[PDB]
Amino acid sequence: ARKETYSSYIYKVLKQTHPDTGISQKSMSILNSFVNDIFERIATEASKLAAYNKKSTISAREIQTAVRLILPGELAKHAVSEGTRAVTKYSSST
DNA sequence: TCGAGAATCCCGGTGCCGAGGCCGCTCAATTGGTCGTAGACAGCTCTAGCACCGCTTAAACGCACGTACGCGCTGTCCCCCGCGTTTTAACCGCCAAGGGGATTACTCCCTAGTCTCCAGGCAC
């Protein structure tokens, strides 16, 4: 039995950015609630936008428009930068 | 003063464009035998709240200086406001080009299902 969390990945990216910093468990649960909340926000907005575009699939175009909707524009263009980086580094399926 | 004739108040007739009804219809609503799958109950434990109080213990209740300022009055002072006047572009009608919205669908391409092998992940 387990509960799905992202404390290991948060600690990994935090030590990757700055290894000389720590984080307690209460703030870890707060950030886990935060990432589940924004995942719920983006997923429901993408489902709304897919149902509005007469298309019952989820591509990356709806996610791009959804992160252009709810995120601010500097974070929106940084998010499309990170997303294009993720697709271009994932497409090399060798 | 009578009477005929013109003006007006009130009653009756008529456009008129939006609400209401209708024929044709055509891709969905109904029912169905089946079929993998949610799910409701139950032993059984285990685990989190509740009460009593052992033992302390800061903190609220409430009353007393005192002065800062909320409410009201008085004077100030000026800035939108009613109004007049001049300007001006909005609305409407109309002429005109054309450009994306809508609808059809096919190969292709990406996914549901399938089994198979392996590396993540909170617990010891």
Q: How many CB atoms lie within 10 A of CB A3?
A: 5
Q: Which long-range contacts (CB under 8 A, 24 or more apart) does A51-54 make?
A: none
Nucleotide nearest residue A57, measured CA to C1': B111
Q: How far is the CA of A74 from the C1' of B118 (A)?
A: 40
Are A68 and A76 within 8 A, CB to CB? Answer: yes
* Tokens (6 digits) for A53: 């575009």
Task: Please report, for residues A28, A36, A49, A74, the alpha-carbon distance to residue A54 in angstroms, rounded to integers and kept in the order given.
Answer: 39, 27, 9, 29
The reply to whether A7 Cβ lies less than 7 angstroms from strand B is: yes
Q: What is the resolution of this structure in A?
A: 4.2
What's the count of helices (H) and strands (E) in chain A, helices before strands? Answer: 4, 0
Q: How far is the CA of A47 from the C1' of B79 (A)?
A: 55
